[PDB]
Structure 1
Amino acid sequence: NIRPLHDRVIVKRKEVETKSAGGIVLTGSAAAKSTRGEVLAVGNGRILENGEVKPLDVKVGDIVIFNDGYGVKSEKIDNEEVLIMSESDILAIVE
């Protein structure tokens, strides 16, 4: 297994849908990378200035919406694309 450090979370990007709002197949630059993923590993928590650690609000098994950016990094583990990225980049939790 792989566990992150501090406030970083392992997520796996969902497959991009080929059909949107009907049976029309979307191919090309219109089908952008999905902004939804499945969390896999969660670190211990962010380190505060005084010294204690606070646990993350997200839990393993939830679906989250994240922003692709400079902080988000892609890493090849066990022949599978995963994302290493900080918790502060997570926007919202679905359901």
Structure 2
Amino acid sequence: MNIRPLHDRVIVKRKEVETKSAGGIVLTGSAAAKSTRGEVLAVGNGRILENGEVKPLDVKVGDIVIFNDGYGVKSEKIDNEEVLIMSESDILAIVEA
């Protein structure tokens, strides 16, 4: 079973936290920090604000993105895996090829 997001909501999963490759071949331990990179599992219908139609999201399924982990970011457990739910506004940028 899988999950269907509601308009302007994007479901993404978090990547590895403080991966041991910082500074070159140097191994970096965890300084109690958390990973800001994720992958887009699902895309909502779009934003329904200003009134004129429904505006489509700029993020396509399967994208790799950078986002700000704020209040708008929620945590759920699907098929015993951790996922994140946030709006389009939260995701700052896309990592490409």
TM surpasses 0.5: yes
* Compared CA separation, residues 30 and 10, structure 1 to 2 (3 A): same
- Compute the displacement of 1:22 (Å): 5.3
- 24-33 or 14-23: bigger deviation: 24-33
- 76-85 or 50-59: bigger deviation: 50-59
Q: Deviations over 1:42-77 (max 9, x none)?
A: 011011322410110010111000111111011111
State the superposition RMSD in angstroms. 2.1
- Compute the displacement of 1:78 (Å): 1.2
Q: Structure 1 stretches of 5 or more lacking a match?
A: none
TM-score by length of 1: 0.86
| Alpha carbons 1:6, 1:47 under 8 Å: kept | yes
* Compared CA separation, residues 22 and 31, structure 1 to 2 (3 A): farther
TM-score by length of 2: 0.84
| Alpha carbons 1:71, 1:85 under 8 Å: kept | yes
* Compared CA separation, residues 18 and 57, structure 1 to 2 (3 A): closer
Q: Distance in 2 between matches of 1:31 and 1:55?
A: 37
- Compute the displacement of 1:16 (Å): 1.8
Q: Deviations over 1:62-95 (max 9, x none)?
A: 1000111111011111100000111110000011
- Compute the displacement of 1:31 (Å): 5.3
Report the count of equivalent residues.
95
| Alpha carbons 2:22, 2:28 under 8 Å: kept | no
Large movers: runs of 4+ above 6 Å? none
Q: Structure 2 stretches of 5 or more lacking a match?
A: none
| Alpha carbons 1:17, 1:31 under 8 Å: kept | no
Identity over the aligned pairs, expressed in percent?
A: 100
| Alpha carbons 2:18, 2:34 under 8 Å: kept | no
